[PDB]
Structure 1
Amino acid sequence: MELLFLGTGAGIPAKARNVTSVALKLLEERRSVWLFDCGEATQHQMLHTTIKPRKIEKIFITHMHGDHVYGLPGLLGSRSFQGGEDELTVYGPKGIKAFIETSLAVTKTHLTYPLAIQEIEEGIVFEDDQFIVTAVSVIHGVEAFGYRVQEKDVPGSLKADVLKEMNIPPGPVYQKIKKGETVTLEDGRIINGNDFLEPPKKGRSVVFSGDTRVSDKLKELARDCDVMVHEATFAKHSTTEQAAVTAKEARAKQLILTHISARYQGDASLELQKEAVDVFPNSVAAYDFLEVNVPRG
């Protein structure tokens, strides 16, 4: 699991930073990538990476600002042009449906894959046996959402070499053992499946703020998360400091600041980082193509 920042700017594109988009790579976990926001030229940034449109499974939009969505039509179109056939779901605030459906309609685009669009509300926006994503209205009167991607604890992996070494060849019995069932082997031995499973893997979690302002809702949303990705500036100081205080109180493990305006160049960026670091040591001022690993434990 890794975060690959495709665009870390704000408002409008700059040679140094494209408008916002962060890729949550889950190749090992689901053979896919999930995108958080999708500003114009996001697919162009991807051309400089190993990420292809076909690998994108989901796209989550935090706010209906142009610098967060104008890259969607193009990305959806390229994925179709390239022959992607897997389903893709877009989650976003009200208006995302119209934006997408109207764009694809006027450009006479016929997708080669199933496309699901969900206009979200505070609560659980997606869940399966592996992950659960919750969305929260961060700022009191704002049509923006923060998201928490929570990887669920993973059942302990099977100690297959030990089984083979006990002369228990791969097959149906492996499934029962995996479930913790007691099994009767071909030679008559009785084996307790649980004795052959490693401890469960604790799920990791990444939180995406969606707005520069902070709140208690943000703090609780990010409680004990591995990485908190926050928008540091408005496209137009204490903001960063507050983000850092929030991460500290929420006990997040790492704070990454993105959505940095042109006003901050070169050293200015490092000063932004320093502001956060003074409160929360493990803080980062993201930059385009930065990649952050999210290890278990």
Structure 2
Amino acid sequence: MELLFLGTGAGIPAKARNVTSVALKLLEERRSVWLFDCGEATQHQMLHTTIKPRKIEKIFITHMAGDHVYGLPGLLGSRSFQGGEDELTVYGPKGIKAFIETSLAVTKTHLTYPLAIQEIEEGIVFEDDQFIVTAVSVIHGVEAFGYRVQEKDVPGSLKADVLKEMNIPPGPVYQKIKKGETVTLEDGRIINGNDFLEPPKKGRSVVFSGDTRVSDKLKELARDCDVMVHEATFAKEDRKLAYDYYHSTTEQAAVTAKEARAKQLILTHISARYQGDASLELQKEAVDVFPNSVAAYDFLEVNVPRG
């Protein structure tokens, strides 16, 4: 599981930063990648990474904003252009269906795969046995969300060499044991899987605030979270500039992380008004509030380890 930022920009593309799109790699977790927001030219950034279209299972959009979605049409099309048969679900706000649907239609684009578009709302927007992705409304205007990708706890490791020392040959009967199931051994022996198990490994969590003004909702969404990808469009001083555009300030994101007891904070969606010099300044403004902070940047990849 790794975070690979494909565009850390804001408003419009700049040679320094492309418009927003953060990729959550879950290849060894579920064999795929999830994009969060897909600003224009996101597929283009990808051609510089090892992330491949067909490997994207689901795109989550934070709020309808060309710098967050003008990249869907061309991306999905490319996935179809290169084969891709798996299903892809786009999760977004009201408007996302129309946008995607119209774009393909006018372009007479027939997708060689199943496209599920879901216009979400607060609460669980996707869940299975491995992950639970809850969304929430953020301060940036009606139809704006912050997402939390929560990986559910994984089972404890199998005390395999106790099973062996008990003369229980390693084989299928093993995974049944790994599942807590009580089984009957070839020797009419009965053991309770649960007995030979290690305490469960807590699962990772990543949060994407999207575009928003300092919010208490968001604070709660990222509780104890592992990584909170937070947008910091402005420096500390421009507190007013942020409020009016419904954005946030480095120091603001940092307070948020600290208050949420998040483990790490990544500042993204930086405005071109700051330089490759200010970028470390922006970062410092945050580090003074929340030690473990990082100013995201195009192609920065941050692995998320099992704490």
- Give TM-score scaled by structure 1 length: 0.94
Is the Cα–Cα contact under 8 Å of residues 46 and 52 in structure 1 kept in the other structure? Answer: yes
Q: CA deviation at 1:21?
A: 0.3
2: CA distance between counterparts of 1:208 and 1:255?
A: 10
Instruction: Decide whether aligned partners of structure 1 residues 76 and 165 sit closer, same or farther in structure 2, where only a CA change above 3 A counts.
Output: farther
SS for the counterpart of 2:270 is coil
Is the Cα–Cα contact under 8 Å of residues 85 and 113 in structure 1 kept in the other structure? Answer: yes
The CA deviation string for residues 205-255 of structure 1, in whole angstroms up to 9 with x for no partner, is 1110012411110110111100011111069x9711111111101100011
Is the Cα–Cα contact under 8 Å of residues 25 and 33 in structure 2 kept in the other structure? Answer: yes
1: CA distance between counterparts of 2:161 and 2:88?
A: 37
SS for the counterpart of 1:165 is coil
Is the Cα–Cα contact under 8 Å of residues 204 and 296 in structure 1 kept in the other structure? Answer: yes
1: CA distance between counterparts of 2:269 and 2:195?
A: 49
The CA deviation string for residues 245-284 of structure 1, in whole angstroms up to 9 with x for no partner, is 1110110001101111110111111111001000000000
2: CA distance between counterparts of 1:244 and 1:259?
A: 15
Q: What are the equivalent positions in structure 2 for 1:1-20 lying under 5 Å apart?
A: 1-20=1-20
- Give TM-score scaled by structure 2 length: 0.91
Is the Cα–Cα contact under 8 Å of residues 140 and 213 in structure 2 kept in the other structure? Answer: no
SS for the counterpart of 1:238 is coil
SS for the counterpart of 1:90 is strand
The CA deviation string for residues 54-74 of structure 1, in whole angstroms up to 9 with x for no partner, is 110000000101000011111
**Bigger Cα displacement from structure 2, 26-35 vs 161-170:** 161-170
The CA deviation string for residues 5-42 of structure 1, in whole angstroms up to 9 with x for no partner, is 00000111111100000000001110110000001110
Is the Cα–Cα contact under 8 Å of residues 244 and 283 in structure 1 kept in the other structure? Answer: yes
Is the Cα–Cα contact under 8 Å of residues 212 and 230 in structure 1 kept in the other structure? Answer: no
2: CA distance between counterparts of 1:164 and 1:77?
A: 52
Is the Cα–Cα contact under 8 Å of residues 10 and 234 in structure 1 kept in the other structure? Answer: no
1: CA distance between counterparts of 2:205 and 2:214?
A: 19
The CA deviation string for residues 108-142 of structure 1, in whole angstroms up to 9 with x for no partner, is 11111111000011111101011111110011743
SS for the counterpart of 2:24 is strand
Is the Cα–Cα contact under 8 Å of residues 248 and 279 in structure 1 kept in the other structure? Answer: yes
Cross-structure match for 1:263 = 273
Instruction: Decide whether aligned partners of structure 1 residues 91 and 234 sit closer, same or farther in structure 2, where only a CA change above 3 A counts.
Output: farther
Unmatched runs of 5 consecutive residues or more in structure 2 = 236-246
Is the Cα–Cα contact under 8 Å of residues 39 and 67 in structure 2 kept in the other structure? Answer: yes
Is the Cα–Cα contact under 8 Å of residues 212 and 234 in structure 1 kept in the other structure? Answer: no
- Over the aligned positions, Cα root-mean-square deviation in angstroms equals 1.9
SS for the counterpart of 1:245 is helix
Identity over aligned pairs, percent: 100
SS for the counterpart of 1:134 is strand
**Bigger Cα displacement from structure 2, 278-287 vs 195-204:** 195-204
Cross-structure match for 2:243 = none
SS for the counterpart of 2:29 is helix
Q: CA deviation at 1:185?
A: 1.5
Is the Cα–Cα contact under 8 Å of residues 212 and 248 in structure 2 kept in the other structure? Answer: no
2: CA distance between counterparts of 1:175 and 1:278?
A: 48
Is the Cα–Cα contact under 8 Å of residues 20 and 39 in structure 1 kept in the other structure? Answer: yes
Instruction: Decide whether aligned partners of structure 1 residues 74 and 165 sit closer, same or farther in structure 2, where only a CA change above 3 A counts.
Output: farther
Q: CA deviation at 1:165?
A: 6.2
2: CA distance between counterparts of 1:169 and 1:116?
A: 45
Is the Cα–Cα contact under 8 Å of residues 212 and 239 in structure 1 kept in the other structure? Answer: no
